[PDB]
Design a protein around this ligand. Structure first.
Ligand SMILES: CCCc1nn(C)c2c(=O)[nH]c(-c3cc(S(=O)(=O)N4CCN(C)CC4)ccc3OCC)nc12
Ligand SMILES: [Mg+2]
Ligand SMILES: [Zn+2]
Length: 326
């Protein structure tokens, strides 16, 4: 009974952020039950003062959180509720412990937490291995971020659902602003857009021109932050990263088997279940080509975000050792 779950959530006591450990970049959700992750999400809206500043009703927030959780497919190995929850938790830790909070407006923080929780809504486990698709000479020919547009539509749908309207207390303007920020934040999770815009972001930082008052730079930064949180599984303590890496591998292999039957093509190592031995080398490659630069750049933005980078490096060292097969 969906109602039974709601009644349980809305009536439970929400433990403190400290007890929940949602402030740690090292936070893990493995020992938490769905109910507990929901309680964590409430603590996130509360401690970021979103419930207060936007007068959200307890029951309505609980319902919205349960609706979001419900619209994720538990059958998809990695891109499910737990990934979205972790993304939001990383966003919370970055805002608080990473001190990104005071560099943003209350609306932007509102949009970011909502986006982090809704960016992979109704994901089917389809991943695009062609990571350079945004830089191809004809990139403008194949519509980009199709699924991300779907995730947002889903996000918007749930926000406008009777009893789930956590943004009802906003003005007509505040609402419009918040929805635009959310849409961009969600679209930013298309890794291709990260590849396309990171160069610009890195340079602004390298040359000391970074300026969050410039709306264009604020938007670029929000996109980079979304990516940072989205990939943060790669920064977790070794044992946790290993398990998360398995889930990612499993969703890849599932696609490989699915495409073999539907497209009559054999999978590349990335999506070949018989190639688990090549995972560590690929992780090192993923880290070097995609992660390190992002977390390093974020550390320049705020030194307190350093632990994400640090955790990432430690994992590189772990995966590398395995790559060399001890
Ligand atoms: C879409 C999944 C993004 C992602 N998140 N996380 C935490 C990981 C990860 O740990 N590894 C990989 C990953 C990336 C590449 S990649 O850098 O070569 N590249 C191709 C595949 N796309 C989807 C990502 C980029 C190759 C293998 C990977 O997982 C190995 C188990 N992707 C993600
Ligand atoms: Mg996505
Ligand atoms: Zn994601």
């Amino acid at each position: 009974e969906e109602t039974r779950e709601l009644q349980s959530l809305a009536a439970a006591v929400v433990p403190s952020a400290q007890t929940l450990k949602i402030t740690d970049f090292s936070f893990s959700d493995f020992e938490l039950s769905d109910l507990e992750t929901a309680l964590c999400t409430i603590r996130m809206f509360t401690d970021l003062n979103l419930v207060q500043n936007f007068q959200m009703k307890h029951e309505v927030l609980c319902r919205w959180i349960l609706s979001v959780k419900k619209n994720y497919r538990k059958n998809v190995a990695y891109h499910n509720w737990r990934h979205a929850f972790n993304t939001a938790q990383c966003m919370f830790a970055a805002l608080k412990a990473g001190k990104i909070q005071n560099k943003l407006t209350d609306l932007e923080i509102l949009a970011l937490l909502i986006a982090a929780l809704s960016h992979d809504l109704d994901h089917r486990g389809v991943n695009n291995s062609y990571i350079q698709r945004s830089e191809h000479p004809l990139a403008q020919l194949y519509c980009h971020s199709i699924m991300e547009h779907h995730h947002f539509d889903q996000c918007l749908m749930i926000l406008n659902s009777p009893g789930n309207q956590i943004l009802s207390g906003l003005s007509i303007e505040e609402y419009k602003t918040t929805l635009k920020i959310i849409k961009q934040a969600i679209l930013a999770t298309d890794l291709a857009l990260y590849i396309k815009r990171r160069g610009e972001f890195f340079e602004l930082i390298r040359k000391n021109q970074f300026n969050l008052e410039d709306p264009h730079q604020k938007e670029l930064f929000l996109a980079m932050l979304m990516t940072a949180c989205d990939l943060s599984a790669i920064t977790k303590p070794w044992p946790i990263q290993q398990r998360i890496a398995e889930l990612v591998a499993t969703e890849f292999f599932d696609q490989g088997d699915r495409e073999r039957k539907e497209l009559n093509i054999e999978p590349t190592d990335l999506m070949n279940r018989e190639k688990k031995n090549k995972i560590p080398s690929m992780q090192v490659g993923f880290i070097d080509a995609i992660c390190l630069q992002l977390y390093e750049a974020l550390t320049h933005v705020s030194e307190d975000c350093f632990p994400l980078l640090d955790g990432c490096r430690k994992n590189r060292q772990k995966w590398q050792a395995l790559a060399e097969q001890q």
